[PDB]
Every structure is written in structure tokens, then in C-alpha cells.
């Protein structure tokens, strides 16, 4: 159809709505798009950047000499966040320079000038450098996640590693400094690494993060077991206390079709229900509940089958599993032979699919949410290309109300889900290098 | 803590070009982290940077000195040298050779008075 | 090229005074800052790096903040053996730039 849209001039990964501006994260660029028609308003050229020797992250090295070029390398960028407490800003980290982060300052009276104020974040390690703080985010797989807490801000992490010694972390907590200069690792228990035996043989995909119920959540794809080729889907939750990351179990999260098993979560969205679906799951209108799509593996893989299932856990009721004490210590921490030991649960967690199988001949590749009276609506994306809106009740499920091809290329998870006053608003949806508005209610 | 020691003419002619070396002891002068710079002190006067060598090998000046300066290092005799040239009164200075990271200096040896004097 | 402006360049307090030097930059530092204490016929100390961060041997009563152009160092109870001259270096861009120096002496 004819709807609001902006095709980029590169791929685009992340995206962020922000005083009625969407800042489009992509390769090479960020874009400033106009929240009425996607009109273009402003772009930040990120890359392609110089990788050099003699050049470090974050100094102006123009000024050096005739600097005889190593590699030139394209500027994926791999997170976007906006912090609203020590300024109103933008960070967004990139692919390239360490995983080093850069920070857009908003001029009070102009909010679409992302060029006026950029601060980069890095402060040169001396005493350990080999432990860089500000190296924040990995070109393989990230997810940053940005907390408020005694009026200091902290950024929890999810690295996909490989093996390149050089020193990033798996999960990691950091402080951003009242200086707004750098981050710093409070204590030796504010991360938490894969050893150096298993980097690659134990790779570890870093699928949402969110905070709830005064937790950290991190949902994960990983091996079952060290030496098992079966992949898994898994949900990391610690606590936030002592400026440190306490009370770390990572355990199974299942979904099931009645035993058809949907293993690997593709994508997930935390949200409030529905009146009508509150009811049917034992939850509240104000619970946190966290929606998630999963999809079948291609045995010894972590590929997906083009075979989908979608299933709800309300966290008040993924937090009271946790607290039934059977049990074994993190595997991919120690060698294999909320208040010290880190966790990982044998016994998964399972949930019934809440389409009954209505999408076991696609890929659902995105998952949106937002409620309609008593009615929970789910703004799904699939690897075809292929948009579609559908109510969501337990008790029968139905034919998808809306449903069509948006693109040829695969929806993107990566998604934003606005209100204008009257309940009634819209959603931004990615497809490749395209971005577009849909509306709610049809 | 590796320690540096300079060493190199007290006295040069004017118009003559200067030689100094900083010998390294306790680690070596070969690092992926850690690299060499010169930086110099006139008489009752602040300090002032003259030129690195990083890793990689390439070296930098100060655009001072550029035209005059050359740093070079020596792998198998732990140690690095700087080669001023042109040499005038004003180059009248102690000279201190310093390891560098990131770009700031941590280690320092104790200096060399070089005094340019005919 | 990029001017480091020192002050004041002398000082003199006290044994147990808090005394306090301001390094300002003529250009963005951001965080590629040192600070070195100068005792007098000797080599440079570096006692921070990175405008803030204390250097592994040096005493808790030094501590440094500041971030873009204005940076300062203090010295929260001085010593006698802390007499010296005291200088700012920038990194952030070549060449590196030492500020003038501050000498500190002690009240007595």
C-alpha cells in the first residue's frame, strides 16, 4: 500500500523514537527522519573508518602526519541509546573502533541536531590495558541495555565472542562517569566472561535484554550443553545490587506445540496485556509480560526451519519457577569438572503456543504488541517479507486481520511501537534498508 | 618496572647535528602495547614534546623540529636514539626519553644535559 | 598547536592545606589529559592519567577531574615532600602540548 515510508542508502540495524524525531541506526550512517511522513531531515556520516596502528579510539588523528592508511572498514552499528538523565543525548556505538561509543548532545531549543555536540567516550587505560572499560559493544552480536540507579547510570551488555585477544565480556555491567568521559568496572563481579577453552566451540547469541520486577533479564541462544550440538534458548536473570552482577541463574525457556519443540527464540517484546489475555493467563493489566517468537532448528544448528511458534511468560511467574529449589554451577564459566555461585538450571521452563500452531509454514523473524480494548494485538514481521496483525486469546485463535507483503526482504526484530492521544497510534517496521510507518487498528 | 638511561655528547658544536640513544633495561624495546618518545626541557623552562615511534615503526615530529629530527630504534641492542640536526643555541636543553602509552608517558629516564656551545 | 594554559604558576600553603591547580585547554581534550609532579633536578612522575585516574604508586591525598577544555589537580592535605613543579599534558591530538607548570611551595 501507500504508506509512510524511507528507503536508506545502507542496510539499517537499530532504530530509536525520540521528541518526535526516529533516529535510524545503519551501516555508515545515522539518519534523522521527520515522526509524520518519514521525511528526511538530517544524516551523521559514521563510516567507513580508518583502522590504523598508530591511531587510537576517540583522538583526533587528522593531527598526527601523512598517515600512511592500514584498512578503511564499514561502520555497522550495533547499538543506539538514549539517555535523558545527565543530558539529553543520543549514544550509539559502532562496529568499528574497539566498540568504542559516541555521544550526540540535543541543543535545548533544536532537537534534530545530532552534528552540534558529539562527545566520544574513551579515556586511555594505563595502569591494565588490556582491560578497556569503553570497549562497550562487539562487531559479532550486542545488546546494550541502559538502567537509572542512585543517580548514576549503568549500561548492561551482551557480547557475542570469538576468540581475538587484544578483551571484551560476555555479560557485563559499567558506569558511565559523573565526567561523562568513560565507564568504569566497579568491581571483578560487574562482569562475567566464556573461558578461553570454549570461545568458539561455546558461542553464545545475545537474542533481547530488559529490566523487571527490580531484575536484569538477558534472553540468549547457546548450546544445550558444552559438548551437545543441539541449540537452546535460555533466560539469563540477575540482580542489580552492590553495583555488581549477584544472584546470576540462566535457565531454559521452552515453547511447545500440543511434543513439536520451538527452540530457538528469533525475537521478543516486553509488554502489558490485554483485559481479555490478563484473564486467561493468570495476569494482571499492569504485569510485565514477555511475548516471544520461536522458531525450529535444522538439527546440530541454531539455524531456523521456517516453522514458528509464538508463547507468553508473564515475569511474576518466570521469577516464582526461579524460586523452586535440580541445579547445576554455570558450565561456560567454571570448568565443566537476589544476595556468590552463578547458575545455570537443568529444568526448562515450557509454555504452551498461544497461536496452536497457526504459524508452523513460516519464519517469523519480528514480534510487536500493543492492546486494543480488551483485545492484545501482535504486529508480526516474517523472513518473507510478509507483515501481518492478529488478535491474541488462548482461548481460539484467529485468522490474521491484517497481512501482507511489506518487502521482499526479512522483517527485522529491531521495532518501535508509539501511542498518539486516543489509544490509537502506529509502528515503525524494518525490512533490509527500508523503513516504514503502519498504523495500529488496520 | 623496566628502567631507561640516556647517553650522548654533553657538548656540541653549533651548525653540528646532535646524537643521543636511550638504552632499555628490564623489558624489551619490541612491545605491541608500549612504545618510545623524546621530549626535551630548556634551561628554567616547561617541557616540550619532540617525536614518538610507535610498533608499527612509523615516527612522528614535532612540527617545531620536523625538517631537523629522526627517532629509529635498535632491536637487537634494546635501544632507541634520536638524531637532531642544524643544531642551534636555542636546541640548548635536557633530554629525556620516556615510554609511552597511549600516547601519555609513565616511565622516564633521568635525562641528558646537552649543551650546544662552541 | 593546541595552547595548555597552567594556574596559577606559583603557589604557596600550609602543611595540611588543601591546595588545588587548573589546567585549561585551548580545544575538545575530552579525557586525554596527565598530570606529572616535577621535584627539581629530576625526571617527570606521572601521578594521574585520562584527567582523573591515579597512578598505581601514588599517594590518595592527589586527585584530578575536568573533562573538555577545564581540567584541575588538588592536593586534598599537602606535605612537605610535595614541594615540586607541577604540569598538564594533552594527548588528543599531535603534537602533544605541556602547560607552563606550577611551582608549589610550603608555608612554614
Known amino acids: 500500500y501507500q504508506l509512510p515510508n524511507f528507503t536508506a542508502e545502507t542496510p539499517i540495524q537499530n532504530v530509536i523514537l525520540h521528541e518526535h524525531h526516529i533516529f535510524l541506526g545503519a551501516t555508515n550512517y545515522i539518519y534523522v527522519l521527520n515522526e509524520e511522513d518519514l521525511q528526511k531531515v538530517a544524516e551523521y556520516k559514521t563510516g567507513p573508518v580508518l583502522e590504523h596502528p598508530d591511531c587510537f579510539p576517540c583522538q583526533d588523528c587528522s593531527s598526527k602526519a601523512n598517515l600512511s592508511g592500514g584498512v578503511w572498514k564499514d561502520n555497522i552499528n550495533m547499538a543506539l541509546v538514549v539517555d535523558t538523565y545527565y543530558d539529553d543525548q543520543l549514544i550509539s556505538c559502532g562496529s568499528v573502533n574497539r566498540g568504542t561509543c559516541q555521544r550526540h548532545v540535543f541543543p535545548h531549543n533544536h532537537t534534530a541536531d545530532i552534528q552540534s555536540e558529539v562527545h566520544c567516550i574513551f579515556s586511555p587505560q594505563i595502569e591494565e590495558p588490556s582491560q578497556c572499560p569503553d570497549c562497550v559493544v562487539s562487531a559479532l552480536g550486542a545488546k546494550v541495555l541502559s538502567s537509572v540507579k542512585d543517580r548514576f547510570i549503568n549500561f548492561f551488555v551482551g557480547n557475542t565472542i570469538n576468540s581475538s585477544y587484544f578483551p571484551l565480556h560476555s555479560i557485563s555491567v559499567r558506569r558511565l562517569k559523573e565526567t561523562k568521559d568513560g565507564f568504569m568496572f566497579l568491581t571483578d563481579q560487574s562482569y562475567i566472561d566464556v573461558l578461553p577453552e570454549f570461545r568458539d566451540s561455546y558461542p553464545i547469541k545475545y537474542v533481547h535484554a530488559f529490566e523487571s520486577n527490580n531484575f536484569i533479564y538477558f534472553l540468549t541462544v547457546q548450546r544445550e550443553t558444552l559438548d551437545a550440538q543441539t541449540f537452546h534458548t535460555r533466560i539469563i536473570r540477575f540482580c542489580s545490587i552492590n553495583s555488581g552482577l549477584h544472584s546470576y541463574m540462566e535457565m531454559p525457556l521452552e515453547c511447545i506445540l500440543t511434543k513439536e519443540v520451538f527452540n530457538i527464540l528469533q525475537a521478543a517484546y516486553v509488554s502489558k496485556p490485554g483485559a481479555q489475555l490478563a484473564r486467561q493467563i493468570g495476569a494482571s493489566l499492569n504485569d510485565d509480560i514477555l511475548f516471544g517468537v520461536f522458531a525450529q532448528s535444522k538439527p546440530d544448528s541454531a539455524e531456523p526451519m521456517d516453522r514458528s511458534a509464538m508463547c507468553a511468560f508473564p515475569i511474576k511467574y518466570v521469577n516464582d519457577f526461579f524460586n523452586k529449589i535440580n541445579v547445576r554451577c554455570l558450565q561456560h564459566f567454571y570448568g565443566p569438572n537476589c544476595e556468590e555461585y552463578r547458575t545455570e538450571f537443568t529444568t526448562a521452563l515450557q509454555r504452551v503456543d498461544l497461536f496452536m500452531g497457526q504459524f508452523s509454514e513460516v519464519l517469523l523473524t519480528s514480534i510487536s504488541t500493543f492492546i486494543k480494548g480488551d483485545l492484545t494485538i501482535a504486529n508480526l514481521g516474517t523472513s518473507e517479507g510478509r507483515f501481518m496483525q492478529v488478535v491474541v486469546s488462548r482461548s481460539g485463535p484467529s485468522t490474521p486481520h491484517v497481512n501482507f507483503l511489506l518487502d521482499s526482504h526479512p522483517v527485522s526484530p529491531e521495532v518501535i511501537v508509539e501511542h498518539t492521544l486516543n489509544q490509537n497510534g502506529y509502528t515503525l517496521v524494518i525490512t533490509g534498508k527500508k523503513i516504514t510507518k503502519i498504523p495500529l487498528n488496520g | 618496572q623496566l628502567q631507561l638511561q640516556e647517553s650522548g655528547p654533553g657538548l656540541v658544536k653549533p651548525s653540528e647535528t646532535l646524537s643521543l640513544t636511550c638504552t632499555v633495561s628490564?623489558?624489551?624495546?619490541?612491545?605491541?602495547?608500549?612504545?618510545w618518545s623524546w621530549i626535551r626541557q630548556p634551561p628554567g623552562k616547561g617541557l616540550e614534546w619532540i617525536g614518538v615511534?610507535?610498533?608499527?615503526?612509523?615516527?612522528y615530529y614535532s612540527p617545531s623540529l620536523k625538517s631537523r629530527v629522526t627517532i629509529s630504534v635498535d632491536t637487537s641492542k634494546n635501544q632507541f636514539s634520536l638524531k637532531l640536526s642544524s643544531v642551534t643555541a636555542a636546541d640548548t636543553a635536557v633530554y629525556y626519553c620516556?615510554?609511552?602509552?597511549?600516547?601519555?608517558?609513565?616511565?622516564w629516564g633521568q635525562g641528558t644535559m646537552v649543551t650546544v656551545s662552541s | 598547536d593546541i595552547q595548555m594554559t597552567q594556574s596559577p604558576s606559583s603557589v604557596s600553603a600550609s602543611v595540611g592545606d588543601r591546595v588545588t591547580i587548573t589546567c585549561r585547554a585551548s580545544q575538545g581534550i575530552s579525557s586525554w589529559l596527565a598530570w606529572y609532579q616535577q621535584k627539581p633536578g629530576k625526571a617527570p612522575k606521572l601521578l594521574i592519567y585520562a584527567a582523573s585516574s591515579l597512578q598505581s604508586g601514588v599517594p590518595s591525598r592527589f586527585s584530578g577531574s575536568g573533562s573538555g577544555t577545564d581540567f584541575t589537580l588538588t592536593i586534598s592535605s599537602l606535605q612537605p615532600e610535595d614541594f615540586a613543579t607541577y604540569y598538564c599534558?594533552?594527548?588528543?591530538?599531535?603534537?602533544?602540548?605541556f602547560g607552563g607548570g606550577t611551582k608549589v611551595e610550603i608555608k612554614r
Open positions: 599534558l594533552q594527548a588528543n591530538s599531535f603534537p602533544p602540548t
Open positions: 628490564g623489558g624489551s624495546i619490541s612491545s605491541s602495547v608500549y612504545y
Open positions: 615511534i610507535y610498533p608499527s615503526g612509523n615516527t
Open positions: 620516556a615510554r609511552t602509552i597511549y600516547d601519555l608517558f609513565d616511565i
